[PDB]
Structure formats: C-alpha cells, structure tokens
Design a protein around this ligand. Structure first.
Ligand SMILES: Nc1ncnc2c1ncn2[C@@H]1O[C@H](COP(=O)(O)OP(=O)(O)O)[C@@H](O)[C@H]1O
Ligand SMILES: Nc1ncnc2c1ncn2[C@@H]1O[C@H](COP(=O)(O)OP(=O)(O)O)[C@@H](O)[C@H]1O
Ligand SMILES: Nc1ncnc2c1ncn2[C@@H]1O[C@H](COP(=O)(O)OP(=O)(O)O)[C@@H](O)[C@H]1O
Ligand SMILES: Nc1ncnc2c1ncn2[C@@H]1O[C@H](COP(=O)(O)OP(=O)(O)O)[C@@H](O)[C@H]1O
Ligand SMILES: Nc1ncnc2c1ncn2[C@@H]1O[C@H](COP(=O)(O)OP(=O)(O)O)[C@@H](O)[C@H]1O
Ligand SMILES: NC(=O)c1ncn([C@@H]2O[C@H](COP(=O)(O)O)[C@@H](O)[C@H]2O)c1NC=O
Ligand SMILES: NC(=O)c1ncn([C@@H]2O[C@H](COP(=O)(O)O)[C@@H](O)[C@H]2O)c1NC=O
Ligand SMILES: NC(=O)c1ncn([C@@H]2O[C@H](COP(=O)(O)O)[C@@H](O)[C@H]2O)c1NC=O
Ligand SMILES: NC(=O)c1ncn([C@@H]2O[C@H](COP(=O)(O)O)[C@@H](O)[C@H]2O)c1NC=O
Ligand SMILES: NC(=O)c1ncn([C@@H]2O[C@H](COP(=O)(O)O)[C@@H](O)[C@H]2O)c1NC=O
Ligand SMILES: [Cl-]
Ligand SMILES: [Cl-]
Ligand SMILES: [Cl-]
Ligand SMILES: [Cl-]
Ligand SMILES: [Cl-]
Lengths: 355, 355, 355, 355, 355
C-alpha cells in the first residue's frame, strides 16, 4: 500500500541537514554502515542484546536502536525513533525477514533507499522468474513434476537435493521425509529445476537513477554448508557415507569473471534493469545481484536474484577488483549506496532513490 | 621478421611528450588501462560495438579505436591510428588471438611492451616445454602415446579428459568422438601428460629490465567450467550422471602461497627469466605467469606458462597481498606495467622494454 | 622457566628510542615486517642463504641476521645481535619450530610480543583441547580407540586419513603402513576425531591488552594438497585411482563469514580469551586463530587453534574486508601487531604485551 | 553574440565518451589540468615554444596544441582542433587576454565551462562595481575627481599611486608623467578610490549549479612587486629613496580568515551569486573570487572580483585548509572544476555548466 | 567550583558506545568537528541562525544545537541536550567568551576536553605572566608606569599603541581618548610592555596525558588589521596619514621555524607544561599555544599564550609541515584532539583528559 507521495512527505518533515543512514545490524550492514560513515553520514544500527558486539567493535554505528527481538523493527516505536533521527533506511536480507515483507510494503513508515515494490518480485519465485524470463535472461529449465525429470535436476523447497530420474526424486524425497527434514507439504510444492553445472558468479550491480546507469561493483561465489564441505571429502569416502547435501549460505569467496564475459555481464544487468522499469516502476534502484552459473559454453545462467543488496558484497567491504576501477578507491557496495544518497540529497533528487 | 631497430625508429617519430598506452578491450585490459591512467598516461582501448560497455562504464579508456571485428586490429588502418596516437601497445591474450600471432611477429608495426619474439615460445607447447625444461622447472611427465599411460593422466588437444589406463584413454577418446567434441585429427595429436594432483597457484611475475629483477605481483587459482561445477556435485550424484569434465577458464580466485614456498616461487621466476635470456633475447620482459600445481611434497609443478600478462591478474586489479608489500599501494599488474613504461621513458631506456 | 621480570629487565637495557621489530624470514613475516615499517619501526629479519630473496625483493626488512640454518636462532650469538638491536621478537609458526619450543620457553632471552607461556597450550593437543573445551567452544567429538568409531572420522598423527568404520580404520592404517608413510608408532598414538562436514573459516582475532578487547582481523580457508587437488578430480576418475588424501597446507584463500554469524564468531574469541586468562595468565596476547568448520546448523566447530599469528593472515597482507572496517585502511595483522607495540611503548605499557 | 543553443549543438557533435578538458598553458592551468587528470579526464594544454616546459615537466597535459603566439587561440584552426578533441574549455585570466574578450564572447566556438556572458562584467569596472554594489557588497568609496579626495586614496589606471590630498594627486600624477609611466590619457580616466587599510583575503568560491550552492575553496593574499618589497625597506631608508610603489602581481601567499568571519564570507558569495543570476543569467557559474580587504571593524571590503578562476587558487594546488574540509582530500580549484564537469556529464546536465 | 569527580559521574551516565564531540560553531570548530568525523566520532555543533552556514556547507557537523544567541550556551537547556548526546565538549576561544568563564568553571555541567581550571590562567594577564615567568620562559619586559618607559613599548588594554617615551605615551593615550576609542578607565589600567621586534611564530603544541608528551603540531603568524595593512603603505604615504595602528586578529598565515630552533621550541613547551602541572593540576591538557616573537638573537619571546586551542591552528586544517611528520597524514589539531579522546576512551583513561 505504502505510497511514494506518502513517503516523500515523511522525508520533508526531515531535517535535511541531518540525514542519517539506518539499517539492521545483520546481513550486509557492516559495510552499509561503514560506507555511510565514509561518505560523511552518521549511522543508525538497529540491533539487540547479544547481536550488537560486531557493530560495537567495528565502530561502525553512531547510534544504536536496541530492540528486544529483531522482530520489533515493525513496531511504531522503532519507526518513530527512525523518523526522529532523519534516517533513510537501507534494506537488506535480514531486514525484510525480521520486519516481514508485508509490513515493509505497507506498514513500515520510514523512508527507504531503493524501490520498495520491487522487494516482492524477489520474495516470490513466480515474479522473480517472470522478471528474469521477461528480461531475457538465461534461467535453468523449470520442471512441472518429478515425472518430467529427464536430466540432473536440483530440487528446492537445507532440504535441497539432486536427482537424475523420477525414481531418484521420490527415493530422495522419501529420505528427507523419513528424517523429518521435509514434510509432505514441502514435497508437494517442491520446485524442480535443471541442475546447471558450472562456475558460480554472484554478480553485484548498482543501478544509479541519478546517472541512469548499471554499474558493476563486484562478484563472489557462495560458500555453502554442508555441500562445500561434503565435496571436499574424497569420492571413495563420500560413497561410504550416508549424508545429504545441504546448501546453507555460510560465507562468500571473492572471484572475478573472465574479462571477455563482462559485455555479457553488463547486458544482463541492463536487460534486467530495463524490464524492471516496465514491470515494477521505477524499477531496480541501487544494488541488485544476479546469482548465476557459468556453463562450459560461457553462458551465464541466473538461478537466483536479489533486488536489494546481496550478502556476497561482504566479500568486498574493503573494496574489490571491480569497485576499484572507477576511482581507485576501496569502494564497497555500502559506500556506493551512501554516495547515491549523498549525491541525491545534494542535487535535490531524493525522489529518484527513496520510496 | 619485425626488427627492433625497425620498431625503435617508429617510436622515434613518436611525440615523446604524449606517449599513450594502448591495448585491446578484453582479457586483462581493465587494469592495463586503469593502471596507465593511474601512472598519468592517457589510454587507448581497441574495442567494437557490443564489447565496449565495460570500458565505458569503468571510465578506463580515454580514446576508443572501434573495429568492426577484433580481427581488424591487424589492418594498417588500425596500426596507423595507433602510431598517430603515440601508443605503446600492451599485448595480451586476446590480442594475440584476434591479431594472429604471425601478424604480431612481422606485420604489426606498432611499438609493443615486452619481448615480441617470446610470444611464440608460449603459443607452442614444444617451445614452452623446452623453456620450462631447460629453465630447470618441474613439469608434469609427458606421454608419447596412450600405451605409455601408467598412472592418472590428463589429455589435452573443453575437450580435455582424464585417464588412468590405455584402455580408458580410447574409451574416452571414443566418447568425445561419437559426440562431435573431438575429431580423429585432434585425437591423433592429443597431448598426454601426468595428471598432477595438488593446489593451483597461477603465479604472476614481473621481470623488470630497468631494475634487472623478478618481482612477485600476485597469485590466483583458476575457476573453470564445467569441472569446478562438476566437482561441486556429490560423488553419489556424479556417478548417476553422464557428464564429461571441461576446463573452460571462466574466472579466477585469489590465493596466497605458504610463505616458506616463496624462495621456491622466486627461484622459478629467476630460472625461467635467466634461460629465456639465452633462448629468446632479450628474454622475458615484464609480466609473465607460471601456472603451477603444488603437489603434497610442496613442489610446484608448472603445467602451463604465459610470456605476456595472464588473465589471473584480474584477481588483483585493486592490488593484492603481494603487490601491496612493495609500497603499500593497491598495485595491479597493469599499473606495474605502466610504471615500467613511465620510468623507461624518464630514464630514456625505452629500448629495454619495447620491441 | 623464562621469567617476565627477567624479560622486562632485558627490555630496560634497551634503547627505548630505537625499538626494532624482529622475526624469522618465513611463515607470516612479510606482513609482520611490512606492518612494522608502516608503523614507523625499523625491521629485523632472521634469514639464511637461499631463503632471503623474498624479504629482499619485497624491501620489507631493514636489517638481516643471516644464520647457517634457521636452527641457529636459539644460539646466544643470535639472541645477542637481537638484544643489541633493541628488537622485540614477533613469534610465529616457523619460529617456534626452528627455535624449538623448549628453547623458546626458557632459553630464548629476547623480548617477545605476546604471552610466551601460551605457546605450549597450542603445541599440545591435550592443552589445546582443554582450553577450547573449557573456553566452552564446539570441538569435534574425540574417539579414544578405532573401536569407538561410529560415524565418519578423520585421523591425525600428510599421513591423515578418513574412516567410517573400525574396519576401515585398520584397512587404511595398514595401507599407510605398507607404504612407509605411517609407522606403527604413529598408528598407536593416532588421534581420531569426528569428521566435521562444513565450510572452513580460519578466523583471525587480535586480543588487545591495551584496549582489553578482542578484534576480528580476518578469515581465510585453507588450501591443502593433495586433498584440494584430489577433490577437483571427478568422482568417476577418483574411483579409478589409488590415491590417499593428504592435507599439507600450501596456501590460503580469502573468505568472509555470513554477517549474522559474527556474534558467534566474536563470542568464541571472547570465551577463548576469557578462559586463557585463568589458565595461562596473562592469557591470549595479540594475534590468535580459531580454525573452524561451519556445519549446516550454522555452528562453528573449532578443530584447531593458534595462540600466535596464523599463516592465513597472509590472505590479507593488503588488508581485508574486516580489517578495513576499523579505519578504512589496508590493515594487515602484522601491522595490527606493530601498532600494539608502538602504542604500548607510547603509553609505557610494554609489560602488557611482551614476555 | 555566441548563443547557448549554438554551443549545446557543438557539444552534441561531441563524442560524449571522450570529453577532454582544455585550457591555456598559463595563469591557473597547472591545477586546472592536474585536477582534470585526477578526475579521470584527459587534458589539452594550449601552449607555445618557450612557454611549454612547466606543463611538460609537471606531466599535467596529455595533448599539447602549440601556437606561434598565444594570440592565435582565436584562430579557427585552434577552435577546430579543440572541437575535434571534444574539449570543454576552462577559461582563465590569461585566456581571456590572449584570446581577446570580444573573440571570447562571439568568435570562440568551443564549449566553455562557466557563464560566458559574465566574463565581461569582470573586464569592466562599471559592470563589476554595479554587481558588487547591487549584490550589496562593501566596496571602497569611489571618487569622481581628484578634488573630491578627502582621505587617503589609491589611484588606478604598475602605474598605481597613493594620495592623501588633491595636491598630492597632481604632484604624483605629474611624477609618473614626467617619467613616461603615465600618459595624460590614463591620468584623465584615472580611477580614484578609498584606500582601504586592512588585511588582504582573496577569497575563492565555487558556485555549483548542480548543487545550487556556493562553496568556499580557499584564500590567498597577493604578493605584489614592488610594493611588498618596498615596505620591507625600513621607513628611514624608504624616505632616503626616490621610489614609487608598484602593484604587479607576482605570487600568492596562503592565509585563512578568522572563523567567525566565514558567515560574512559566505553571505558575500551568496549575495554576489544571487544578484549575478538576475543581472547576467545563468549568473556566476563555477569559480569566482572576491578580492577583499578586512578593515579593523572586521568588515570585508571588496576592491576587485574575478568571475572566472583567480590566480590565487595556485596557493592551494595541493589543496588547502578549506578545500580539505569537504572530503579530507587535497582538493584544488582546478579539480573542483573538473568534478563539476564530470558530474554534469554523468547526470546529463552539461547545460547547467557550459556556455 | 566544578569538581572532577562531579564530571566523571556525569560521564558515567554516558552511553560509552556513543560518545560524540561537541563545540561551538566558531573560532576553531571547523577542524575540531572535521577532526572528530575523521576519527569516527559523530559531531555536535552549537550554532545559531545566520552563523550556521559554514558548518552546513562544510558538512562537518552531524547534529546542530541551535541557540537564539551564543550566549545561551550556559543555559541548562543546552547543557542537557549536550549530556543527552553523550558529548565531550572541546573548548575554545569563542566558547569561553559566549559562555562566560565563570559559567565555564562552575556552572557548565558538561564533560570538557582538557584541564578546566587552567582556562583562567589564560584569561588573566597576572596568572598568564606568572606561569610564563615561573615556567622559565622569555617574556617582554613589563612596565609599571608610563614613566618607566625607556625604549619602544607596546601598550595594551584595537586600542593598542606604540610608544618610545613617557611623553609619547600620553600624547597617544590622549589621542585615543579624544577619539572615544579609549576611556580614562582603560588608560589607568593600561598594560605597558617591551615592544619585542622580531618574527611572529604562534606555536601550537599538544600535551598528551596518555603519552605524557609535548607534541609540536604547527605554527602560524597572525594577520592583523589594520596594522598589517598599515605597514603595507609606503613610509612617505604613512607620514601623510593620520592613522592609528590596530591589532585586530583577522586571519593567520602559515610559517615554519628555522629547524635549529625546534630544540628551543620544544623546551618551551616542556617547561610550560612542567610548571602548569605544579601550579594548576593536572596542568596543560591537550592543545596550547605559545604566541612568540623571535628576536634577532634567535630567542623566542612569548608575549601571549593560550591554554586551549588557538585560532592559528586554522592555518593547518588540511595538516601542515609539522603535523605531517608523525604519520605522513594531513593531521589537524582538531583531529589530534579527537584522537586523544578516542584513544583515552579505548584505554579507559577518559579521566586523564576530561574535567
Ligand atoms: N539450478 C541450479 N544448479 C546448480 N546449483 C544450484 C542451482 N540453484 C541453486 N543451486 C545451488 O544451491 C544454492 C541455493 O540455491 P538458491 O536457494 O536458489 O539460492 P538462495 O537460497 O541464495 O536464493 C545456490 O547457492 C547454488 O550453489
Ligand atoms: N598436468 C595437469 N594436472 C592436473 N590438472 C591440469 C594439468 N594441466 C592442466 N590442468 C587443468 O586443466 C586446465 C587447463 O589446462 P591448460 O589448458 O594446460 O591451461 P591453459 O589452457 O590455461 O593454458 C588447467 O587450468 C588445470 O586446472
Ligand atoms: N575434524 C575435522 N573435520 C574435517 N576436516 C578436518 C578436521 N580436522 C582437520 N581437518 C582438515 O585437515 C586439515 C589439517 O587439520 P589439522 O592438522 O587439525 O590443522 P593444522 O595441521 O593446520 O593444525 C585441516 O586444515 C582441515 O581442512
Ligand atoms: N581600495 C584599495 N585599498 C588598498 N589597496 C588596494 C585597493 N585596491 C587595490 N589595492 C592594492 O593594489 C593591488 C592592485 O589592485 P587591483 O588592480 O584592483 O587588483 P587586480 O589588478 O588584481 O584586479 C591589489 O592587489 C591591492 O593590494
Ligand atoms: N610585546 C610585543 N611586541 C611586539 N608586538 C606585540 C607584542 N605584544 C603583542 N604584539 C602584537 O599585537 C598583537 C596583539 O597582542 P596580544 O593582544 O598580546 O595578543 P592576543 O590579543 O592575540 O592575546 C599580537 O598579535 C602582536 O602582533
Ligand atoms: N551470501 C551471504 O553472505 C548471505 N547471507 C545471508 N543471505 C541471505 O540473507 C537472508 C537473511 O540473512 P540472515 O539469515 O544472516 O539474517 C537469508 O535468506 C539468506 O539467503 C545471503 N545471501 C544473499 O543475500
Ligand atoms: N585466467 C583468465 O581469466 C583468462 N582469461 C582468458 N585467458 C586466456 O586468454 C585467451 C584469450 O582470452 P579470451 O577468450 O577472453 O579473449 C584464452 O586463450 C584464454 O586461455 C585466461 N587465462 C590466461 O591468460
Ligand atoms: N596457513 C598457512 O599458510 C600456514 N603456513 C604454515 N603454517 C603452519 O606453520 C608451521 C610452520 O610453517 P612452515 O613449514 O612454512 O615453516 C607449520 O606447522 C604449519 O602448520 C600454516 N598454518 C598455520 O599457521
Ligand atoms: N594572483 C595571481 O597569481 C595572478 N596571476 C595572474 N593574474 C591576473 O591574470 C591576468 C593574466 O595573467 P598573466 O599575465 O600571468 O598571463 C592578469 O590580468 C593578472 O591580473 C593574477 N591575479 C588574478 O587572476
Ligand atoms: N588567530 C585567530 O584566528 C583567532 N581567532 C580568534 N581568536 C581569539 O578568539 C577569541 C574569540 O574569537 P572570535 O571573536 O572569532 O569569536 C578572541 O579573543 C580572539 O583573540 C584568535 N586568536 C587566538 O585564539
Ligand atoms: Cl548486491
Ligand atoms: Cl602475469
Ligand atoms: Cl592470527
Ligand atoms: Cl577563484
Ligand atoms: Cl593550539
């Protein structure tokens, strides 16, 4: 429901000499907050007892807003403190979850960097797939039912698994059932897709509304448990084990793509951005991620996407190979975001970047 | 054919107050170009429609020379524009390929950073092997024919494969034949070598003719498709698949060697450089790479080498652990190259570094 | 035996205007030395013929103390040169080994950064396990004998191996016996523990006595041979091989943890530090490492620890994502150590950091 | 005559990927050019034999356009080279003079940073005085004729002189006549004004059209010959001399104002800018200078002004006390100008800053 | 009256995770505030309508506390806002004046950087002279009455004047009387001292309680009106004028002393600091200034001193020749102060630096 005009009129009651930057103490905040500081902003970190330390030892947050549980960040109490601090909020991962995405779309009355509406088109696999499909991006083939399985597939609902046949599907579905990890409910709605075999590049872009431009900021590959520990076990020993792959994100590892694939990489960000404009105006605002896999035909296949800032950006908080190129600075995505805010304020174009 | 005296006399007609740096928009250019800019140079990027974007959004090239296809970079038209811009060319990967290595050795009349002649000793496995062998470097054992196969071997001609027996060789050779990936022609000339099992360090060195010194700039490990995606599949599931490993370079990942192996690492660069002096004078000039594997006996075995700048340097465009040590700067290899140029110009020693 | 008062009285005869920083040319020294230089210190590198080059080409050491073999660093001759240079020694890895840990605890009369006593609690698996256990840290389950083996286990004594049964244990123990890699002596004392399956984070902390605070400096994952080369071989091909995993450290790869796990990460450093205070006063001083594995339940399990600086810090000599956050500098662990020294000298608190 | 639309249509035929920055090798160019380089621009310096060295040894210009005499910079030949290089021209001091201000206002068909029209309102004392007067700025009292002289006055036409009476006026007018320094022509048009006695602050501002804001960049005091050498002679000795003060600008000396006078300083820039908008639209664009004198009542009296960049900015090419405050950078005025250009290009607002 | 224990107990109720730095928008604040920001602090500027602009355009203050008149900064309302923001106050010049020094010594209940008590020993010429005299510093000779005048003297009470005889004294005293500038009241209390003829060095020191050390930060020479404008008038013309010298501080100019005089310069800071310890414990804390004159015998004579930060530090907000030497940074005095605060907080030694 949340209107833009409704948000622009909250921002107007804002002391424009004292715009702070706020976000939740988790996910990507360290460099969101550090990046604000580096751009001259004072930073507000929503945190809680037990989860505050890293924001305290990294000296990255000027003001803390402590909650009892991160769940409370939907409360009017917290929204008020945030408005009283003239904070623009930088959403992420974790913020959407603890706040709840409905609360974010119509209950969270705090100005927010980026296109609010577009946060749903990422929460929903149908919307996400629509966008990537309509944008004209390579996605893994979808499979309506386990009977369609005609190659290796991955099956999504931690409870992930791999299958090369309909038979293998239920064999495994059953396994994860008789072990409590999967309920017949999840198994019914199971999303089955082509298992793309290749190299992982989670590619972090920044669309600048001010500059009307898609920028490449960086790239990481996921570091997942247990899978990445599983495959570090020799095949002989893996076969002697009764173990299921899990794919819990635990970290990220820096990587750079082959330079001749940047034209492809940029086109992918352009296309996505150009279609998101039509489907969810104003479209992709600020940071977004294409989580892709490079098959052996040097084709990047997008198996997931983020419409906010993605966790992999943590791999370059001190800047990386790509973010450096612009101005030879240790530029993080957090800071890149802070700059857009800064510059928008300075050109009186805050309406191009908040919602 | 291209003479040095012939090149020095092209460079003389050059406005020495306006030396630019040129290269082709691909492979390693981003930091070749950015590194020039950082050293005060104005940069020329040879590019083409559709492949130009990343050099435009990274603001890394002052002048573009657009071609219809990168193939045209052999044309006299392009050579002239380059000479008229007082450009020293920085070769790479991609440049050799689109230009063609014959054209580079006797048809490309533009001054070029590094030892021109030595670019062949990298194109040819016989020369390369000679050099590494004569330099005194550990290389994987070669195998004349599939009958000699007495361990695990890798077989080179994308169409790579692994074999642990003569039988397995043809079994697989056939596989890649009946699937169009390999023609009996490639299979006949198949290069078979010891499969070295260990950790990948692509080690980037810089020989400075001015300083007469081998420098360590950085290290990456290859990120290859589909192999690195293949091995991320659990053994159980891999066995249920009918899939062949491919080894297409798609990216690079930063790594540092165990410090006690740097003496070995430096000796390897010294030896290579000292033998390349005798075999292909003036020898290794500027950037070169030993693509090695560290076996469990902490011995680095070189399975490949580059005599120009290697793609892995992209892993440290914002500088890395090793390039930092010299002056605490975010030093890339591109910039290290620009500096040599700069300094050579300033000491009037351009003849120690171009050809 | 070495007393603190005994060490403080060596340091007093020191020219406090000329404190140098010394360490051994290996392990982590490059950034220990570079970090000293960056903090204004003059640096002393103990080296030897053939192992000196990298410290010479990296221009990181002001004075070399050449030995015939690194073994000699216990000699009174070397201790004297070091005292005459007013050097505080920064221990590491390699230093403990060549010097010998007994020699370090009671024969090495040179001031040393960090808690001397605590270097043993890392050399001994019983002490180490006590500390991690008492600190309240997750460790892999221990197994008294091969008969207790009831899951996958790893077995430690290069000569490492994996087992999923008592039968498999001896099958493999025998293998490594009949191949000379393992003697019945090692096999008897074999340490058997739960094979933790997950993502490797070697987490580098710095306890500051001055600031009384645990800082997070960085993280790497080990790059080991042959294992990490072994698992890069396709399962089908691995099965056709007769090859044993080895786990020789050859390098390190940068990684960042999922941000929501930093509270856990910091608590682990706090707990360790708080227990080391009681067990080995003054406790953990300066750099220490928890070498952990993140299981799929996002629990970090510590399978090893260093009480001095760990080799992985080499992954961020030009600084990393975490070290950056403090002051936006390319901060290495070597430099972080130099700073503590510097600052201790300046506040006249050298007794909080040497021993 | 020169139209804006006329200029915007020259700029359109410009390759927007290759905008260079050009100016004349003199006056303030060193930091105009260096500041461009630092912002990523390639720089064009118009120079001539004998006057080129400092731009060559400072490595500040990528391309030189040599003229026979700086006078030629009006020629169509030079305008074409400049248009072909996609150069935006940055006017100064010296450029106006050698080019001639008429040629600049209607004959110089090269895009130019800042408000073209406003360059006249600085060439003419009547316009200048109007502006400062209408802006509401303190100026020294004007004196119609030598008979009005009722205090100390300075008299302007090198040929300057000071008078405290009508009698003294002609006494001195005669002196400079019978010595050839002044012709009866100059003496007739002599401008006579109140001699303001106080401290010199030449205050360099930057109006940003993008940010719609007046910024304080720096301050210098003039270093003039012979006056500043004259007054360094003891009074006793000066009286024994027959010497006339001259006021030839030879250099500049850095100074900072008393902080409590910055509100006054900023108001002066605001007022000037706000009136220049009405009188000469778009008004003051970019760099301008109020050359003032602080009387003992802490009132700043403007005795001169520049509507382009003023020579004093040379006092802070490595940045100064005020330019630092914004981002802690060594920010020069040249660079501040380059940034505006850069940013205007990036927001597609080149029409707010060229003419 | 204000107690330390009384202040330490205000600071305890402070959120130690959110210490801000506050001061008054004037005098030296720009670099006090900027220096805080650079050290990670969030900054509070007390300002008022009309005087706020420079702190707004320099983006140097995160939070403004607007007053109706700077006088109000004594109000409990303002003290509360400041305590609620966890602000340590950095006194200066302007702050003492608007707040009133009595209010500062016993009515201003906000923690304050430096030794509170010592602010009086600077307000009073008797205390100041005692300190400089007892410290063992060269001061100009004092003159009890105009009859003692036996050389050139300067006479202090804007209303300053110079005299070389008793006769000249009253001649001039009368002049400034019959012109309203001096009342018989001021003339009675007139302070008469030796006119020291030499070069002005206002020398800015920083005593660090943490480091127990006097540091040299920088040096400026005063730029005063009308005197410095007066002496720029030729002697002949000055004699034709009826003008009185005034000495209103309007600005500052950077200068460096002859290096061989630094031993003297440092001794002067040591002595002052060592005597201030005895006379006003804890003594000189943080920034202080010796405003001296170098006579021709290379002896520095202190004619004034500041016990807080002096306005001349504005001459090096981007750092200067001396502040650079420590760490090669553009270190201002504001930042040097912020660092002491930072570091004191980090070593839990806030009691060594506040009062
Ligand atoms: N189509 C696919 N082919 C191969 N691996 C995949 C595919 N989709 C996902 N994965 C692996 O499983 C992990 C979880 O996938 P997914 O849940 O889609 O990403 P996320 O949970 O981060 O949105 C991915 O990081 C990737 O490594
Ligand atoms: N002797 C070998 N042992 C194991 N792996 C190898 C060997 N040679 C090559 N490889 C793997 O195959 C990839 C392709 O090898 P190669 O074609 O020699 O390198 P490039 O194509 O980059 O010159 C390498 O990056 C390496 O990972
Ligand atoms: N409990 C475990 N589970 C899985 N892998 C392990 C375990 N312990 C060690 N390893 C692997 O074997 C390597 C050697 O382990 P260890 O010898 O304990 O470390 P280090 O030799 O560096 O002290 C580790 O780097 C890790 O990759
Ligand atoms: N009204 C004045 N009172 C005192 N000095 C002045 C006055 N006007 C000019 N001067 C001095 O003479 C010099 C030349 O003045 P002017 O010619 O107006 O400046 P410019 O030539 O730089 O435009 C100035 O730099 C200043 O030092
Ligand atoms: N003893 C002296 N000899 C010569 N000049 C002096 C002397 N004392 C002060 N002055 C000049 O007069 C100015 C005002 O002096 P004073 O009022 O003592 O300093 P402040 O007002 O800054 O405390 C000084 O900046 C200096 O230039
Ligand atoms: N790559 C990362 O480091 C990363 N960390 C967290 N996420 C995502 O962030 C969301 C919330 O993060 P968390 O559980 O740490 O609060 C999760 O749905 C997870 O998919 C990540 N992935 C993408 O944002
Ligand atoms: N490591 C890398 O990122 C990398 N990228 C490209 N190359 C080599 O560069 C040559 C040309 O590169 P490309 O196909 O991107 O134009 C290829 O033969 C490839 O082996 C690479 N390897 C070595 O130069
Ligand atoms: N991770 C690393 O790069 C690393 N390099 C060396 N070490 C340890 O350092 C010790 C001595 O090192 P070296 O063998 O290079 O002299 C060894 O016991 C080894 O376990 C390492 N691991 C931990 O310190
Ligand atoms: N302050 C300076 O260094 C300075 N240098 C040159 N100017 C002005 O510049 C004009 C041209 O300079 P020049 O003679 O160096 O080419 C002159 O009218 C002179 O008044 C200066 N003053 C203002 O622009
Ligand atoms: N040197 C300077 O720039 C300077 N500016 C101001 N002061 C002193 O500061 C006090 C208050 O300053 P103000 O009048 O700008 O608010 C005055 O007594 C003046 O002597 C200065 N001198 C010493 O602090
Ligand atoms: Cl992102
Ligand atoms: Cl290379
Ligand atoms: Cl460590
Ligand atoms: Cl200006
Ligand atoms: Cl001071």
């Amino acid at each position: 429901m949340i209107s833009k005009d409704e948000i622009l009129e909250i921002f107007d009651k804002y002391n424009k000499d004292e715009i702070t930057i706020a976000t939740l103490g988790s996910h990507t905040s360290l460099h969101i907050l550090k990046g604000a500081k580096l751009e001259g902003f004072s930073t507000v970190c929503i945190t809680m007892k037990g989860r505050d330390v890293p924001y305290k030892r990294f000296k990255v947050a000027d003001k803390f807003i402590y909650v009892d549980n991160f769940s409370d960040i939907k409360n009017e109490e917290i929204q008020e403190k945030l408005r009283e601090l003239n904070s623009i909020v930088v959403p992420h991962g974790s913020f959407i979850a603890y706040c709840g995405l409905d609360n974010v779309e119509n209950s969270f009355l705090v100005p927010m960097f980026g296109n609010r509406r577009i946060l749903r088109w990422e929460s929903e696999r149908s919307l996400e797939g629509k966008l990537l499909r309509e944008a004209g991006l390579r996605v893994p083939k979808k499979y309506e039912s386990p009977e369609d399985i005609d190659g290796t597939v991955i099956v999504k609902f931690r409870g992930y698994f791999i299958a090369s046949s309909t038979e293998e599907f239920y064999k495994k579905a059953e396994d994860l059932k008789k072990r409590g990890i999967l309920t017949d409910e999840d198994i019914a709605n199971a999303h089955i897709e082509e298992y793309v075999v290749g190299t992982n590049f989670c590619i972090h872009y920044f669309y600048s509304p001010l500059k009307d431009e898609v920028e490449l900021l960086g790239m990481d590959k996921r570091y997942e448990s247990n899978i990445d520990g599983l495959v570090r076990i020799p095949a002989k020993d893996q076969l002697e084990m009764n173990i299921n792959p899990s794919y819990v994100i635990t970290g990220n590892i820096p990587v750079v793509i082959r330079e001749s694939l940047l034209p492809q990489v940029f086109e992918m960000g352009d296309k996505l951005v150009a279609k998101a404009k039509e489907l969810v105006p104003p479209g992709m605002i600020g940071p977004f991620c294409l989580q892709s896999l490079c098959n052996e035909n040097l084709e990047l296949v997008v198996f997931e996407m983020s419409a906010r800032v993605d966790g992999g950006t943590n791999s370059f908080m001190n800047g990386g190979p790509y973010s450096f190129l612009y101005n030879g600075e240790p530029l993080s995505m957090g800071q890149r975001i802070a700059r857009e805010i800064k510059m928008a304020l300075q050109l009186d174009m805050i309406d191009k970047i908040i919602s």
